[model samples]
Target: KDQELYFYNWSEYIPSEVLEDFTKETGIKVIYSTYESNESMYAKLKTQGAGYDLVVPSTYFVSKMRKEGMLQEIDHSKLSHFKDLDPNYLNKPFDPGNKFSIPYIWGATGIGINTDMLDKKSLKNWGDLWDAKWAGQLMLMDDAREVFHIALSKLGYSPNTTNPKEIKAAYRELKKLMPNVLVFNSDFPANPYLAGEVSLGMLWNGSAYMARQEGAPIQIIWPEKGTIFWMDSISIPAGAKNIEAAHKMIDFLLRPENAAKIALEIGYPTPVKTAHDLLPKEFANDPSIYPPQSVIDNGEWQDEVGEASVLYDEYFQKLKVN
Candidate 1:
């Protein structure tokens, strides 16, 4: 008997049309739900109100889930196209050998400059958000972890740092920069930036590229002091009700053309090599989607921070509300 696969994910991150196409091809009926932050998703999952067969969570959170024993290890032998995933995203430090999760979508996060509003100086590194000149005009991700990651990395500390002193230092830096922030947002800062609501903001590459398409006159920069490398992956929870259905959905999404469509629609930098080759030349060459090696080198992936994570998160929350 076939089963309905319950999928949980970020809203607007994956296009509904793509999912519709997916359901059409496979007998799997994907009953999907969305939450903006992984925090919210965790809250729901932890409470046991709704059960999700597949979830897309950022790398570090996925690592935490694995460590906390919340997620089930993916059986690689069951995935036909698992080998086709980009080598760079495979065997990551957190998920060595890619056993617990499968890479669904991977992207880089950094600064998006309204080049018309500020010169390149205001845009080069993660530290520039602290520039007094842009006070009350810059936008951060509004996500507590992402905001912490930027401040932590700007100070040359690990995004997953656990030291109390280092966490304090990062908070102080963010507190100083906090007043200048109009609003920390992740969903659609580009629209406001283009409309002149904000001067410059930290943004993901895909949304940044969309702003460019809108002719907002923005230049996307992967910060020099480093930025966050976010990868949203699909994982089956330890208690998932539909493991077979989830595996089928995962394999369906791995199809080269289907994966390419997902990238084309939502515009995140994708990790599927075949999908990359399938994109139109214009999109393929877009530097934001495919950053130069130098830019990529300066950025690092978020790693799982265990016990000390509570301290860093506490400081980040204080920074946001203060």
Candidate 2:
């Protein structure tokens, strides 16, 4: 109660009201900071050694760091609300046995169409992004995995395939879509949509939702071939000094009220089953926020590619430039 908690998370993932409420419920003070992408978050943790108590990293990053012994083991006992989560999101391949992480939020990355400019059903597959009509009209995320996932899916290859040859094939396929990319942005993905800088491209469901809320005329399409879905978890870092405060904060967020509130704030699905029950019908049922179970069943969840990640970066760099 008298302690401080350092929270490192993605930009716009949580709201200030939640943190304020967290302080009211628990006397702990939270020092919150944000990163745009998983790579930057990982780089900060590695370079600075230790300072933040909790970090919300996506699946593959969690796998990468967990294998390297960089995260702290969680005591589910402290997370009293753990039982409220959907079992489907637990014990993922990235963190078997739920050792180093707990799922917090999830959403899909897919084609975002500005229905004001194009038909809502005009784009339905990853292959549609390669159409000549979309050239210079799309905004692909600068994110490596999601970008590659699009090409990989269209090519009939698993996005998580660790083979360099498959990565090369995906790279070659992505080159065709590169001409359509008007902006490659992972940071502030919804800004272009809101500003009318782009009309179509790959976008996270949360970004699409945020844009649509502002009357941006956007629609998120989970491509007919399937899309990439990711779950970001709140994990304690190995170097965290305020571990107790960290656990308390997680418990507080897992409360149904908090989860439902933050889902509206961040525009992603809350994994807490109880939170879903608490949310209003429309928000909870929105296909963009909480994808249909069938899509989740068929979708790809990115996994650590081990050494192939370096090759991915190599090809990703070349794909972004001439």
Candidate 3:
């Protein structure tokens, strides 16, 4: 006689209040858990010996989960607000017809420059992170994959390259820049950049948005090597409980007002087109939150490179040790 929905997601990523609002709107009980990395999320979903009603993983993982048969195709018929989804995100290459995923948020990882102290125009790409002006004033995300992906792209290698030799070259370049790095962190790399402790950061777009809200004179740039475009989606694990309620929750979130609420609360942009238009005039035009099309065209969505992960990890280890 009890109803429950379990959602697993990136820690501090989605607004907790969103789920609470879903619960208030529907009479369904909601239980939530958080994960730090895609690997951990996949491990939990694959080996936990339990099922989750909903999960919000980045685009690549959705492809992995779908290919592995871990995700259940969404029954759009169950979601009345399915039409409310932003048109731009509909029928993405990875989830054509949205069979298995509903995009909840879209974002890009870019440089968060501390313009209060450093000149913003000086940073035009990821390569600029190593510039002498930011020596000992730069913070990089601690994640191995993203850290190396940025480096590889800057070196003219594809972000998804599985070639060991190319990865090695990227690693060596990273070591040279390591000395200039002020910190390597993940929870929130933009903190120091905004606090004046660091002048530049390779950080998630949402985290940079947070710094701006704190009144930090911060500016964001989608590096020229082109940062990765990541979309986190809501998908139900196969054989999930409360399918009807899960659809209701997804519907609640798809609403433009709720979409804007998530962005205002979490710092990630709501992919809902209407929500962007509904925000205050300044926010509607904010390039950091609503990136320009020119910058967007430069982004590449990351994908699963099953064997390449090992190559990525190896180079990252050497980069860290030396």
Candidate 4:
């Protein structure tokens, strides 16, 4: 049991080097696997328990699992590198005081625009997405929570709003923008964006970072109006087959050197504070990867909206239907 750590995470989210390093240092053989969405991952964990020792989930989903008592309490005392985490991203409302999760990587859901195909300066914020000029050239995520939150935030409402009227207004807003949108896709928005098939789209920062890495002429714009800040954390689900190895793996990843490598390679910010110091000035200073603190301060994390999710899904289904 000490030699194994089963992990379920997003496809290609983890670098092989990091895994190699963890195995090298801890001698734990990682049985790695992936899931496309949180819904699928949750279903698998809830139904099968899967014997997975570790899993990474977005903060909101983390809250959902924790509330349902599906996650095991993380033992911070066993983690040597826990202190390396910056206080800014710690004790978030979702896992207050890091009770059930440890911050892994964080990103923003914002606009990814093709600078070569579109006027960058003209497209300032979310409002620009509604402009008729980009009709049939825009894209939005094929996700209810993400898309609805964008609309809610644009209309000056809380992303976690449960008010029925405000939710309907957000739906109307999405319907209005639908004409301008060419598609609603979550995975692989990078493909079309990089190919210049789409001028702009709402996507996570990681997609934008990967597209840029592939030499695409695109820029990630954190809308001045604000956007959702999504953070993924590592946690042990209830009934993990290898609890001690999970703790060791978490500690290994929390090391500044390992954390910096992940942040640099994944093109997203890490919660480890010392990791920044280990990165190159250019990589560390990139605005897309590390937005100004103002944007960071204004960014909101999605929360468990309870019954509001039913309303969200209802409107989302209608938006997709017509």
What is the per-residue lDDT of model 2 for residues 103-165, given as tens digits with 9 covering 90 to 100? 888878887878787887677788888999887988988778888888888888888889888
Best by TM-score: 2
**Pick by lDDT: which candidate is best?**
2
TM-score of 2: 0.94
Residue pairs clashing in model 3 are none
Error of 4 at 42 (Å): 2.4
lDDT of each: 0.78, 0.85, 0.76, 0.82
Question: What's the lDDT of the predicted structure labeled candidate 4?
Answer: 0.82
Provide the lowest-lDDT 10-residue window in model 1: 184-193
Candidate 3: stretches off by over 4 Å:
132-136, 317-322
TM-score of 4: 0.90
Q: Backbone clashes per model, in order?
A: 1, 0, 0, 0
* Candidate 4, superposed: residue stretches over 4 Å from native: none
Q: What ranges in model 2 sit over 4 Å off?
A: none
List the candidates ranked by lDDT, beginning with the highest.
2, 4, 1, 3
Question: Over the full model, what C-alpha lDDT does candidate 1 score relative to the true structure?
Answer: 0.78
